[PDB]
Nucleic acid binder design. Structure first.
Length: 34
DNA sequence: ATAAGTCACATGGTGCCGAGGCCGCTCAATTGGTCGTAGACAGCTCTAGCACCGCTTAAACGCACGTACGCGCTGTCCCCCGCGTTTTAATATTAGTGTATTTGATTTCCGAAAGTTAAAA
């Protein structure tokens, strides 16, 4: 049924968001003096 | 309108910190069990006892009594000490050295034990 697929896709996009935040934090951290 | 998307919310869970709760290792001497032998015993016979008379006269106890002997006696000699005093040496403190003991690791020592037999009234 389609509703579980909707939930799975929503979960996937949420995970992508969560990963993007960490990637941005890491690349920002790599530039700092310390 | 709705698939994508951001977002916060809500719950997940993973990690580290005590901590009170079980647990692990060891040695005391108990008691469990088991060999083998001191122990009490099993017919026993005869020892030196200990009466059990049955004498004798050698001790012995009293009968007498006697110097010896005692026991306080008594002038007096003496000596011990109660102090008083100077001494006087006994405190009782530190001390490090100089063996004195000393407790590990053997490491020989040697006689109790197991044959084997010498000797033994």
């Amino acid at each position: 049924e389609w509703k579980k697929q909707r939930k799975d896709s929503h979960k996937e996009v949420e995970r992508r968001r969560r990963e993007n935040i960490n990637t941005a934090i890491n690349v920002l951290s790599d530039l700092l003096p310390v």
